[PDB]
Amino acid sequence: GLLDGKRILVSGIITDSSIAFHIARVAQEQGAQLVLTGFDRLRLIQRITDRLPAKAPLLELDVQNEEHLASLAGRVTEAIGAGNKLDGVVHSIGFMPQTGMGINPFFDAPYADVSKGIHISAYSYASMAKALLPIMNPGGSIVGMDFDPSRAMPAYNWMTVAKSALESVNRFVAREAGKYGVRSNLVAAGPIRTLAMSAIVGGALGEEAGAQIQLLEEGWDQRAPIGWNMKDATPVAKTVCALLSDWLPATTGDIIYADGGAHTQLL
Amino acid sequence: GLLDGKRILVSGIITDSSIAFHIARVAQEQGAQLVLTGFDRLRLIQRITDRLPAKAPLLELDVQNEEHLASLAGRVTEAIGAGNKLDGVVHSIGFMPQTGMGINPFFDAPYADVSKGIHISAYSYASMAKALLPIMNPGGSIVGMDFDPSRAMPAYNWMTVAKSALESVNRFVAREAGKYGVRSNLVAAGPIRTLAMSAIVGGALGEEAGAQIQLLEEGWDQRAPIGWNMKDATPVAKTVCALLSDWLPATTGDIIYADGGAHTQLL
Amino acid sequence: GLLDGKRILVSGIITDSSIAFHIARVAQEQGAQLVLTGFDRLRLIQRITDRLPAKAPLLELDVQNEEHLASLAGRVTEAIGAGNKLDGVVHSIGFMPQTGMGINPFFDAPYADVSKGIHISAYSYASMAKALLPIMNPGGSIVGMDFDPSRAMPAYNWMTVAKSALESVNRFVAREAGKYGVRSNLVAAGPIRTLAMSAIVGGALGEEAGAQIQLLEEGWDQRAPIGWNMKDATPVAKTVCALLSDWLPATTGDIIYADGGAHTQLL
Amino acid sequence: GLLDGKRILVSGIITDSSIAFHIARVAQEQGAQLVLTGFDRLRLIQRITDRLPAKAPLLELDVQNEEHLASLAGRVTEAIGAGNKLDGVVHSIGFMPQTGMGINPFFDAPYADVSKGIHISAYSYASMAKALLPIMNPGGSIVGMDFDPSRAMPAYNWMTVAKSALESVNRFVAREAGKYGVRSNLVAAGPIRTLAMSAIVGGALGEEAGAQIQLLEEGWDQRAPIGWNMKDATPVAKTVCALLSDWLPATTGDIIYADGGAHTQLL
Ligand SMILES: NC(=O)C1=CN([C@@H]2O[C@H](COP(=O)(O)OP(=O)(O)OC[C@H]3O[C@@H](n4cnc5c(N)ncnc54)[C@H](OP(=O)(O)O)[C@@H]3O)[C@@H](O)[C@H]2O)C=C[C@@H]1C(=O)c1ccncc1
Ligand SMILES: NC(=O)C1=CN([C@@H]2O[C@H](COP(=O)(O)OP(=O)(O)OC[C@H]3O[C@@H](n4cnc5c(N)ncnc54)[C@H](OP(=O)(O)O)[C@@H]3O)[C@@H](O)[C@H]2O)C=C[C@@H]1C(=O)c1ccncc1
Ligand SMILES: NC(=O)C1=CN([C@@H]2O[C@H](COP(=O)(O)OP(=O)(O)OC[C@H]3O[C@@H](n4cnc5c(N)ncnc54)[C@H](OP(=O)(O)O)[C@@H]3O)[C@@H](O)[C@H]2O)C=C[C@@H]1C(=O)c1ccncc1
Ligand SMILES: NC(=O)C1=CN([C@@H]2O[C@H](COP(=O)(O)OP(=O)(O)OC[C@H]3O[C@@H](n4cnc5c(N)ncnc54)[C@H](OP(=O)(O)O)[C@@H]3O)[C@@H](O)[C@H]2O)C=C[C@@H]1C(=O)c1ccncc1
C-alpha cells in the first residue's frame, strides 16, 4: 500500500484512456481514498469512473469558473467528512483551442484562444493550489501533468508555450505549498494515446499536424534508452503515485520525467 | 560601424533610462538607421527620443491593438521608403499589473491581469514578428528582452511566468523567421535601474517587494564573475547590437545572457 | 515493503553518518536483501555495518582496481547464491584530493590529482555498471549519488567538475543498462553532515573553504521551499529507494533532486 | 575592424579546414594581431599557417607538457614585444583516443585513455587560462571550443563526457578570469567537416560509428531553423570573434551556440 489511507483529489478524467483515469486506478490499487473532479460532461464522467476498482465521490470543477473554485474546499471536506484533510492533489488538465495547435500556422492563433489555453493549462495549477492548500495535511503532495517544452516542436505550438508557463507556475506554487509542509511537482510524460491524442494523429487537427505528431511518437521509443509504449499510461500513473507518496520527501518545485529517458538522449 | 546601413526597428522607449533608449543610442552610434515605436504617451516619447545622436521616425504601436499591428508594416516601409526592408527588430516591451508582481501574494492575481501581462510581455513578441517578417531582409535579426526565469524568485511572480512563456515563444518565432533567413533571439539582462525599476525598489509595489528586489540586486554583482553595474545599461545595449549584427550568424531560437555571468554561478 | 525481496548492492559506507549507511538502513527497513562493498579500511566498515537492522555480506571493492572489478560479479553471485541476480546497485562513492577542492586555488590542482578524483567520482560509475549489468534482472535499477554542478560554486572546485562528468557518464550508462531492462539515474542531494563534510566545515581544507561551505549550507535551507536538514540523510535515502523501486519505471539517464527544492529557486 | 589592434593567441590549427584556421583567418580579416600555437607536427603547421591573410609567430604548445606551459607566457610576450599584453585567447583543442569514441563499446575505454582525453580536452582550458591570464589586458577574452553534451549521443561517447567536464571547467575559469577583467566563454558548434571529422564519417573509427555520425549531421540541418552547413566553418569563426570583441562585454562563464539553432528544437 504505497498510498495507504491517503486522501487524494484527482482531476481531468474524461475517458478510460485519460492519464488521470490511470493515475486514479493505480492510486486506489495502492490504498488511496479518492475524490474526483470532472468538467462539463458530468453524467459521462460518472459512467467512466464507475469502472475504477473502488467508488469515489465526483465533484464538478470548471477550472475557469470562480464559483467552482471558491466552493471547492467546502465541497471536498464535505465529501471526505469534517475534520479530514487531503494528502494529495492531481492536476491532469490541458486545453488549447484548434487555432493554437496543429494545422494553423503559429502566427495565426488569436490571443483570446491562446489566453484560454494558458488559463486552463498553466494558471489553473496555481488556482487549484490556492483553493486546496487550506485543506491539505503536512507532508502532502500536489502533482501536475507536464510535457518537456524546453525545445520547440512541430504541431504543439501554443500548447508547448502553455507548458513552459506551467513549469514556471509550479516553481512558484512550491514556495506557497512549502508553508503548509506540502510539495509541488510536475510529471513530464512522453506521448500517450488518449482518445483526443489518437484523434489528432488520425488527422483531427489537419494532415500536416497529424504527420508531425506521428513522427514525434516514433522517434520517442527509439531515443528512450528503456523504450516507450504510448498505449500504456501505467508507467506515468506509477510515477505520479511515487510523487504522492512519502518516498520523494525532499523534491519540490521540480519536474520528474516519466518519458522513457527520451529527453536525456539526442538520438 | 557594427550596424552600418542596417535598418532597425526599436520598440519600448519611455524614458532616457529605458533599456530600449540605450539600445537605440548604441545602434545609431554604430551606423544604424532607426525606426522607433512608442506606446500611449507619444508626445513624451517624441521629446525623449529627440536626444538620440540622430533623428528617427516615431510610430505608435500598442502591442495589444490589432489595427496598430495590421497597419505596422505599411507604416514602416512608408517611413523607410518603398522598396526598402528592415534588417533588425527590437522587442523591449514588458508589463505586468500591480496585482501580478510585488506585495500581492502570488495566489491573488486575477487571470485577467495575468493574461494582460502575458499578452504584452510574451505574445506580442510573436505578433511583432508576424507583422514585420514580410518586410525583413535575409540575414535579418529579431531580438527581444528577457530575464532568466528558470528558477523562481521573490516579487517578480507572474512577470517571471511571462518570461518563461516568452523564452518558449522565441523558439517558435525562430522556426518562422528561419524561412526568411531571419534570426530570433532573446537577451537575458541582469537588473537595471530604469525609472519603473527604481520606483519599485523605492517601495512602489509595497515594502516587502522592495526589500526583496534590493536583495536580488546586491546578490547580482557578488555572483557575477565580472561584476554587475545596474545603473549602466550600455553592456546590455551592446549585446543586443551584437545580435543585430552579422557576427552571430548561426545563433537562433536562443538566449544570450548579458548578466555579468551571474546565472552561471551558484554563489 | 517498497523493496520486498529485491537484491541490492550498496557501496560507499565508511561511517554511521555516510549517505550510503542511511540508504542501506532504509532499504533493509523496506525488505531489501543487501550486499555491501567497502574500500580500504575493511575491519572498520565491518564494525559499522554490524549496526544495520539486518546482516549483509561485505565485499572489498577499490573502484580503481581492475582485479576487484573483474572478480566483482563472481563474488556477488557467490554471496547471493548461484542463479540469483541483483535488482539494484548503489554508487555512493566520491573522492577529490586536497589539492582539487578547498584552500588551493582552482589553478593549482595538478592533473594527476584531478584525474584520480574523476576516476573514482565519475568513471567508476561506468565501470561499476559494466561489472554488474551481466548479473542484473530486467526491471533493475542503478542509482548514483550526485550534487548539482550546473553552476560553479566556491570550494568544491574540481569535485564539481567531477559531478558534471558523472551526470554525463550517467546518460551513457543509461543507453547500456537499457539493453538489460535496467534503469540508470542519479540523485542530486543537498549538503549533508557526513564525518568528512563536518571536518571540512571545521576547517580541514583551510579556513576560506570552511567559511564558504558554511555559507552554502545556510543558504540551502532558506532557498528550499520545504527546508533542508543537513544533519538528516533519511530524505535522500528514501529518494534512492524510490529509484530502486518499481515506482519510477519510466525514468532513466536522469537526475532526481533530493535537495529540498533549493535548485528550483534563485533565492 | 571588429578586432582592430587586439592581440590574440589562437591554438589548435592542424589543417586548412581546422576550426582554428578559420577563427584565425576571420580574426586577421578583422584587424587582429595573432600569435599561434601548434602541437607536434610544427613544420606542417608552419606551412598551413603561411596561407593566412597575414603572418603570425608560431609557438610550440603541447597542452600536456608542464615545461611548455611554464614557459608559455615568457615566449608570448617575447613574440609580441615586452610591455604588450594579450587581449584574447582561443582554445580550439580536442582529443580522445580511438578507444573512447566510435566503434568501441562505451564500457571498453580504459581510464588511461579517457584520462588523456579529458586532460587535453577539458583540463587544458584551465591550464591555458592559468598560464596566460598574467599577460592579459582588462577587457580581455578567453574562448574555447565546445559541443552540446547535455544529452547523450551515439559514437561521441567519452568525448561527450569530456565536453561536459569542459563546460564545467569554463564556469570556474570565469571566476579566476574575472579578477583580471577577463571573460571566459565557450562556443558550442554544430558538426564541421574538418579532416579528422571527414575521416571518421569515412569509417576511420569503424562502420557503426561512421553511420551514426552521418545521421547526426543530416538531422542537424533539418532541426536548425536557419539551416546548418557542415562544410562551412566561417559562421563559427565569426561567433568566436564576436566573443573576442567588445560587443559581448557582460557575458562570462557561458556558452554561445553557433549551431544553427539546432539545440533549441526537438525536431
Ligand atoms: N496525452 C499525452 O500524450 C500527454 C498529456 N500530458 C498532460 O497530461 C494531462 C492529461 O491529458 P490527457 O491527455 O489525458 O487529457 P486532456 O484532454 O489533456 O485533459 C483532460 C481533460 O481536461 C479537460 N478540461 C478542459 N477544460 C477544462 C476546464 N476548464 N476545467 C477542467 N477541465 C478541463 C479537458 O477538456 P476537454 O477536452 O474534454 O474539453 C479534458 O476533458 C494533460 O495535462 C496533458 O497535457 C502531458 C504529456 C503528454 C503529451 O501531450 C506530450 C506532448 C508532447 N510530447 C510528449 C508528450
Ligand atoms: N529593467 C530591468 O531590470 C530588466 C528589463 N528587462 C526587459 O527589458 C525590457 C525593458 O524594460 P524596461 O525596464 O526598460 O522598461 P519596461 O517598462 O519593461 O518596458 C518599456 C515600455 O513598454 C511599455 N508597454 C506597456 N504596454 C505596452 C503595450 N501594450 N504596447 C507597447 N508597449 C507597452 C511599457 O508601458 P508602461 O509601463 O509605460 O505603461 C513601457 O512603456 C523589458 O522587456 C524588460 O522586461 C529584462 C531584464 C531586467 C529585469 O527586469 C530583471 C529581472 C529579474 N532579474 C534580472 C533582471
Ligand atoms: N556529503 C554530502 O553533502 C554530499 C554527498 N554526495 C555524494 O554522495 C556520496 C556520499 O558521500 P559521502 O559524503 O557519504 O561520503 P564520501 O566520502 O564522498 O564517499 C564514501 C566513501 O567512498 C570512498 N572511496 C574513496 N575512494 C574509493 C575507491 N577508490 N573505491 C571505493 N571507494 C572509495 C571514500 O574514501 P575515503 O574518503 O574514505 O578515503 C569514502 O570512503 C558521494 O558521491 C557524494 O559525492 C552528494 C551531494 C552532497 C554534497 O556534497 C553537496 C555538495 C554541494 N552541494 C550540495 C551537496
Ligand atoms: N569538428 C567538429 O565538428 C567540432 C569541433 N569542436 C571543437 O572545436 C575544436 C576544433 O576541432 P577540430 O575539429 O578543428 O580539430 P581537433 O582535431 O579537435 O583539434 C585540433 C588539434 O588539437 C590537437 N591536439 C591534440 N592533442 C594536443 C595537445 N596535447 N596539445 C595541443 N594540441 C593538441 C589535435 O591533435 P591531433 O589530432 O592532431 O593529434 C589537433 O591537432 C575542438 O575542440 C573540437 O572539439 C566542437 C564541435 C564540433 C563537433 O565535434 C560536434 C560534435 C557533436 N555535435 C556537434 C558538433
mmCIF file of N, CA and C in Angstrom, chain D residues 178-263:
data_model
loop_
_atom_site.group_PDB
_atom_site.id
_atom_site.type_symbol
_atom_site.label_atom_id
_atom_site.label_comp_id
_atom_site.label_asym_id
_atom_site.label_seq_id
_atom_site.Cartn_x
_atom_site.Cartn_y
_atom_site.Cartn_z
ATOM 1 N N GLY D 178 37.731 36.766 -14.166
ATOM 2 C CA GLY D 178 37.043 37.948 -13.630
ATOM 3 C C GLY D 178 37.889 38.926 -12.821
ATOM 4 N N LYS D 179 38.803 38.386 -12.009
ATOM 5 C CA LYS D 179 39.755 39.165 -11.202
ATOM 6 C C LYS D 179 40.702 40.013 -12.068
ATOM 7 N N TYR D 180 40.838 39.644 -13.342
ATOM 8 C CA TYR D 180 41.680 40.350 -14.307
ATOM 9 C C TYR D 180 40.869 41.246 -15.252
ATOM 10 N N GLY D 181 39.553 41.333 -15.040
ATOM 11 C CA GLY D 181 38.652 41.979 -16.014
ATOM 12 C C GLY D 181 38.522 41.175 -17.305
ATOM 13 N N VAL D 182 38.766 39.865 -17.217
ATOM 14 C CA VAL D 182 38.780 38.988 -18.395
ATOM 15 C C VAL D 182 37.552 38.073 -18.382
ATOM 16 N N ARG D 183 36.964 37.870 -19.559
ATOM 17 C CA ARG D 183 35.809 36.967 -19.765
ATOM 18 C C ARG D 183 36.289 35.585 -20.216
ATOM 19 N N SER D 184 35.492 34.568 -19.884
ATOM 20 C CA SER D 184 35.729 33.193 -20.278
ATOM 21 C C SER D 184 34.405 32.626 -20.748
ATOM 22 N N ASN D 185 34.403 32.096 -21.975
ATOM 23 C CA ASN D 185 33.217 31.528 -22.587
ATOM 24 C C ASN D 185 33.568 30.444 -23.572
ATOM 25 N N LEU D 186 32.560 29.641 -23.884
ATOM 26 C CA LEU D 186 32.697 28.560 -24.826
ATOM 27 C C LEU D 186 31.775 28.840 -26.002
ATOM 28 N N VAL D 187 32.190 28.427 -27.206
ATOM 29 C CA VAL D 187 31.275 28.372 -28.354
ATOM 30 C C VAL D 187 30.933 26.913 -28.631
ATOM 31 N N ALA D 188 29.644 26.579 -28.568
ATOM 32 C CA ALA D 188 29.176 25.234 -28.923
ATOM 33 C C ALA D 188 28.828 25.237 -30.401
ATOM 34 N N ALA D 189 29.619 24.526 -31.201
ATOM 35 C CA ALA D 189 29.457 24.485 -32.648
ATOM 36 C C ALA D 189 28.620 23.272 -33.060
ATOM 37 N N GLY D 190 27.978 23.352 -34.226
ATOM 38 C CA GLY D 190 27.428 22.154 -34.864
ATOM 39 C C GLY D 190 28.560 21.372 -35.534
ATOM 40 N N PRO D 191 28.230 20.244 -36.179
ATOM 41 C CA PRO D 191 29.310 19.412 -36.728
ATOM 42 C C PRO D 191 29.961 20.086 -37.920
ATOM 43 N N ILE D 192 31.281 19.934 -38.033
ATOM 44 C CA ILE D 192 32.042 20.586 -39.098
ATOM 45 C C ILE D 192 32.958 19.567 -39.749
ATOM 46 N N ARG D 193 32.960 19.559 -41.079
ATOM 47 C CA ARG D 193 33.829 18.670 -41.827
ATOM 48 C C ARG D 193 35.287 19.127 -41.804
ATOM 49 N N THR D 194 35.972 18.901 -40.679
ATOM 50 C CA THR D 194 37.431 19.008 -40.592
ATOM 51 C C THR D 194 37.981 17.776 -41.263
ATOM 52 N N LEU D 195 39.301 17.693 -41.413
ATOM 53 C CA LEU D 195 39.935 16.486 -41.981
ATOM 54 C C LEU D 195 39.598 15.234 -41.142
ATOM 55 N N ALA D 196 39.931 15.283 -39.852
ATOM 56 C CA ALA D 196 39.594 14.203 -38.916
ATOM 57 C C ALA D 196 38.101 13.829 -38.931
ATOM 58 N N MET D 197 37.220 14.828 -38.900
ATOM 59 C CA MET D 197 35.783 14.552 -38.904
ATOM 60 C C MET D 197 35.364 13.803 -40.157
ATOM 61 N N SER D 198 35.851 14.228 -41.326
ATOM 62 C CA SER D 198 35.547 13.539 -42.597
ATOM 63 C C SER D 198 36.098 12.120 -42.642
ATOM 64 N N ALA D 199 37.253 11.912 -42.005
ATOM 65 C CA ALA D 199 37.876 10.588 -41.950
ATOM 66 C C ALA D 199 36.953 9.623 -41.186
ATOM 67 N N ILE D 200 36.435 10.111 -40.056
ATOM 68 C CA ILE D 200 35.522 9.360 -39.190
ATOM 69 C C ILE D 200 34.195 9.000 -39.881
ATOM 70 N N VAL D 201 33.590 9.949 -40.599
ATOM 71 C CA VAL D 201 32.415 9.606 -41.408
ATOM 72 C C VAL D 201 32.783 8.693 -42.582
ATOM 73 N N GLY D 202 34.044 8.720 -43.017
ATOM 74 C CA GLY D 202 34.554 7.754 -43.998
ATOM 75 C C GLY D 202 34.773 6.356 -43.415
ATOM 76 N N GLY D 203 34.722 6.247 -42.086
ATOM 77 C CA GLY D 203 34.754 4.944 -41.415
ATOM 78 C C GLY D 203 36.051 4.693 -40.677
ATOM 79 N N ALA D 204 36.776 5.756 -40.349
ATOM 80 C CA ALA D 204 38.067 5.626 -39.668
ATOM 81 C C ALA D 204 37.914 5.032 -38.270
ATOM 82 N N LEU D 205 36.780 5.293 -37.623
ATOM 83 C CA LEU D 205 36.540 4.775 -36.289
ATOM 84 C C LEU D 205 35.518 3.643 -36.322
ATOM 85 N N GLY D 206 35.469 2.935 -37.454
ATOM 86 C CA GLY D 206 34.533 1.836 -37.661
ATOM 87 C C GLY D 206 33.248 2.236 -38.367
ATOM 88 N N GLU D 207 32.557 1.241 -38.913
ATOM 89 C CA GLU D 207 31.367 1.464 -39.718
ATOM 90 C C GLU D 207 30.094 1.894 -38.953
ATOM 91 N N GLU D 208 29.826 1.291 -37.796
ATOM 92 C CA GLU D 208 28.716 1.738 -36.954
ATOM 93 C C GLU D 208 28.878 3.195 -36.525
ATOM 94 N N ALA D 209 30.075 3.575 -36.081
ATOM 95 C CA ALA D 209 30.321 4.959 -35.651
ATOM 96 C C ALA D 209 30.116 5.937 -36.808
ATOM 97 N N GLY D 210 30.661 5.588 -37.979
ATOM 98 C CA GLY D 210 30.523 6.390 -39.187
ATOM 99 C C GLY D 210 29.069 6.652 -39.551
ATOM 100 N N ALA D 211 28.263 5.594 -39.556
ATOM 101 C CA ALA D 211 26.849 5.696 -39.895
ATOM 102 C C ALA D 211 26.099 6.605 -38.911
ATOM 103 N N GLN D 212 26.406 6.473 -37.625
ATOM 104 C CA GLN D 212 25.743 7.271 -36.609
ATOM 105 C C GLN D 212 26.094 8.767 -36.731
ATOM 106 N N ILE D 213 27.386 9.062 -36.933
ATOM 107 C CA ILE D 213 27.866 10.437 -37.145
ATOM 108 C C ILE D 213 27.138 11.049 -38.329
ATOM 109 N N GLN D 214 27.037 10.294 -39.418
ATOM 110 C CA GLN D 214 26.375 10.806 -40.599
ATOM 111 C C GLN D 214 24.909 11.159 -40.344
ATOM 112 N N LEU D 215 24.229 10.351 -39.529
ATOM 113 C CA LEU D 215 22.822 10.599 -39.165
ATOM 114 C C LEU D 215 22.689 11.839 -38.309
ATOM 115 N N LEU D 216 23.593 11.973 -37.353
ATOM 116 C CA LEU D 216 23.669 13.164 -36.538
ATOM 117 C C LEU D 216 23.779 14.421 -37.436
ATOM 118 N N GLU D 217 24.659 14.396 -38.446
ATOM 119 C CA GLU D 217 24.855 15.547 -39.360
ATOM 120 C C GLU D 217 23.621 15.919 -40.177
ATOM 121 N N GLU D 218 22.943 14.921 -40.741
ATOM 122 C CA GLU D 218 21.762 15.174 -41.562
ATOM 123 C C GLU D 218 20.636 15.759 -40.741
ATOM 124 N N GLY D 219 20.429 15.198 -39.556
ATOM 125 C CA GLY D 219 19.466 15.732 -38.613
ATOM 126 C C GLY D 219 19.713 17.202 -38.272
ATOM 127 N N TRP D 220 20.972 17.644 -38.330
ATOM 128 C CA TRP D 220 21.353 18.966 -37.810
ATOM 129 C C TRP D 220 20.729 20.099 -38.610
ATOM 130 N N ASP D 221 20.880 20.012 -39.930
ATOM 131 C CA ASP D 221 20.362 20.988 -40.875
ATOM 132 C C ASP D 221 18.831 21.057 -40.877
ATOM 133 N N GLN D 222 18.195 19.895 -40.695
ATOM 134 C CA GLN D 222 16.736 19.791 -40.575
ATOM 135 C C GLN D 222 16.239 20.560 -39.323
ATOM 136 N N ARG D 223 16.804 20.297 -38.138
ATOM 137 C CA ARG D 223 16.395 20.971 -36.876
ATOM 138 C C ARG D 223 16.722 22.454 -36.838
ATOM 139 N N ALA D 224 17.869 22.826 -37.402
ATOM 140 C CA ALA D 224 18.322 24.210 -37.379
ATOM 141 C C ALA D 224 17.320 25.139 -38.075
ATOM 142 N N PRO D 225 16.631 26.002 -37.313
ATOM 143 C CA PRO D 225 15.697 26.871 -38.017
ATOM 144 C C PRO D 225 16.347 27.753 -39.100
ATOM 145 N N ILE D 226 17.658 28.012 -39.023
ATOM 146 C CA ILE D 226 18.336 28.682 -40.143
ATOM 147 C C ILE D 226 19.226 27.763 -40.995
ATOM 148 N N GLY D 227 19.109 26.449 -40.833
ATOM 149 C CA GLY D 227 19.985 25.548 -41.587
ATOM 150 C C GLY D 227 21.376 25.453 -40.993
ATOM 151 N N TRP D 228 22.070 24.396 -41.385
ATOM 152 C CA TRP D 228 23.463 24.204 -40.991
ATOM 153 C C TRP D 228 24.294 23.711 -42.171
ATOM 154 N N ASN D 229 25.400 24.400 -42.419
ATOM 155 C CA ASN D 229 26.334 23.992 -43.466
ATOM 156 C C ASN D 229 27.620 23.498 -42.820
ATOM 157 N N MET D 230 27.711 22.185 -42.644
ATOM 158 C CA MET D 230 28.879 21.494 -42.063
ATOM 159 C C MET D 230 30.209 21.667 -42.799
ATOM 160 N N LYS D 231 30.174 22.083 -44.053
ATOM 161 C CA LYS D 231 31.450 22.296 -44.715
ATOM 162 C C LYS D 231 31.903 23.749 -44.666
ATOM 163 N N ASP D 232 31.158 24.578 -43.939
ATOM 164 C CA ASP D 232 31.494 25.979 -43.808
ATOM 165 C C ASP D 232 31.697 26.367 -42.340
ATOM 166 N N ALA D 233 32.957 26.558 -41.946
ATOM 167 C CA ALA D 233 33.293 26.864 -40.569
ATOM 168 C C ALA D 233 33.256 28.366 -40.281
ATOM 169 N N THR D 234 32.985 29.189 -41.299
ATOM 170 C CA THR D 234 33.028 30.634 -41.063
ATOM 171 C C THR D 234 31.953 31.180 -40.079
ATOM 172 N N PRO D 235 30.710 30.662 -40.126
ATOM 173 C CA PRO D 235 29.739 31.058 -39.098
ATOM 174 C C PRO D 235 30.232 30.838 -37.657
ATOM 175 N N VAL D 236 30.968 29.758 -37.398
ATOM 176 C CA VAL D 236 31.526 29.584 -36.067
ATOM 177 C C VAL D 236 32.740 30.467 -35.816
ATOM 178 N N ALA D 237 33.563 30.681 -36.842
ATOM 179 C CA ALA D 237 34.681 31.594 -36.714
ATOM 180 C C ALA D 237 34.188 32.973 -36.328
ATOM 181 N N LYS D 238 33.102 33.422 -36.964
ATOM 182 C CA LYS D 238 32.565 34.773 -36.699
ATOM 183 C C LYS D 238 32.084 34.896 -35.245
ATOM 184 N N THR D 239 31.446 33.830 -34.764
ATOM 185 C CA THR D 239 30.905 33.768 -33.406
ATOM 186 C C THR D 239 32.001 33.914 -32.355
ATOM 187 N N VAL D 240 33.114 33.207 -32.540
ATOM 188 C CA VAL D 240 34.298 33.340 -31.680
ATOM 189 C C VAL D 240 34.824 34.779 -31.693
ATOM 190 N N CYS D 241 34.913 35.376 -32.878
ATOM 191 C CA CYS D 241 35.305 36.781 -32.971
ATOM 192 C C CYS D 241 34.343 37.699 -32.233
ATOM 193 N N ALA D 242 33.047 37.405 -32.318
ATOM 194 C CA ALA D 242 32.059 38.197 -31.613
ATOM 195 C C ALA D 242 32.440 38.185 -30.137
ATOM 196 N N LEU D 243 32.868 37.020 -29.646
ATOM 197 C CA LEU D 243 33.221 36.853 -28.236
ATOM 198 C C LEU D 243 34.567 37.481 -27.896
ATOM 199 N N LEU D 244 35.494 37.512 -28.857
ATOM 200 C CA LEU D 244 36.790 38.178 -28.649
ATOM 201 C C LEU D 244 36.654 39.712 -28.634
ATOM 202 N N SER D 245 35.553 40.204 -29.195
ATOM 203 C CA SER D 245 35.306 41.635 -29.349
ATOM 204 C C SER D 245 34.815 42.248 -28.061
ATOM 205 N N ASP D 246 34.511 43.538 -28.141
ATOM 206 C CA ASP D 246 33.963 44.300 -27.026
ATOM 207 C C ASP D 246 32.440 44.304 -27.035
ATOM 208 N N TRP D 247 31.824 43.542 -27.946
ATOM 209 C CA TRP D 247 30.369 43.572 -28.105
ATOM 210 C C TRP D 247 29.558 42.598 -27.254
ATOM 211 N N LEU D 248 30.220 41.645 -26.601
ATOM 212 C CA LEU D 248 29.570 40.819 -25.581
ATOM 213 C C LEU D 248 30.230 41.052 -24.216
ATOM 214 N N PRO D 249 30.154 42.298 -23.688
ATOM 215 C CA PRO D 249 31.012 42.648 -22.528
ATOM 216 C C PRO D 249 30.500 42.153 -21.172
ATOM 217 N N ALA D 250 29.266 41.654 -21.139
ATOM 218 C CA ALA D 250 28.645 41.195 -19.898
ATOM 219 C C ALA D 250 28.369 39.690 -19.907
ATOM 220 N N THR D 251 29.048 38.962 -20.795
ATOM 221 C CA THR D 251 28.849 37.515 -20.895
ATOM 222 C C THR D 251 30.124 36.814 -20.429
ATOM 223 N N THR D 252 29.988 35.922 -19.452
ATOM 224 C CA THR D 252 31.109 35.123 -18.974
ATOM 225 C C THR D 252 30.637 33.869 -18.223
ATOM 226 N N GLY D 253 31.512 32.865 -18.138
ATOM 227 C CA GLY D 253 31.158 31.543 -17.623
ATOM 228 C C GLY D 253 30.117 30.834 -18.480
ATOM 229 N N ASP D 254 29.962 31.286 -19.718
ATOM 230 C CA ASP D 254 28.767 30.984 -20.510
ATOM 231 C C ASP D 254 29.056 30.218 -21.792
ATOM 232 N N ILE D 255 27.996 29.836 -22.492
ATOM 233 C CA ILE D 255 28.125 29.095 -23.747
ATOM 234 C C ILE D 255 27.294 29.777 -24.841
ATOM 235 N N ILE D 256 27.935 30.139 -25.952
ATOM 236 C CA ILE D 256 27.201 30.674 -27.101
ATOM 237 C C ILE D 256 27.112 29.547 -28.120
ATOM 238 N N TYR D 257 25.897 29.297 -28.601
ATOM 239 C CA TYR D 257 25.646 28.190 -29.516
ATOM 240 C C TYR D 257 25.682 28.669 -30.967
ATOM 241 N N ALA D 258 26.749 28.305 -31.671
ATOM 242 C CA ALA D 258 26.864 28.588 -33.091
ATOM 243 C C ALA D 258 26.550 27.278 -33.794
ATOM 244 N N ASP D 259 25.272 26.908 -33.798
ATOM 245 C CA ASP D 259 24.853 25.573 -34.196
ATOM 246 C C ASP D 259 23.619 25.613 -35.100
ATOM 247 N N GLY D 260 23.298 26.792 -35.624
ATOM 248 C CA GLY D 260 22.115 26.966 -36.460
ATOM 249 C C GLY D 260 20.799 27.035 -35.710
ATOM 250 N N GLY D 261 20.862 27.021 -34.374
ATOM 251 C CA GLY D 261 19.662 26.928 -33.526
ATOM 252 C C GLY D 261 19.161 25.510 -33.293
ATOM 253 N N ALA D 262 19.885 24.522 -33.829
ATOM 254 C CA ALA D 262 19.517 23.097 -33.698
ATOM 255 C C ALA D 262 19.173 22.639 -32.270
ATOM 256 N N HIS D 263 19.970 23.045 -31.284
ATOM 257 C CA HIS D 263 19.741 22.651 -29.882
ATOM 258 C C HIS D 263 18.473 23.220 -29.261
#
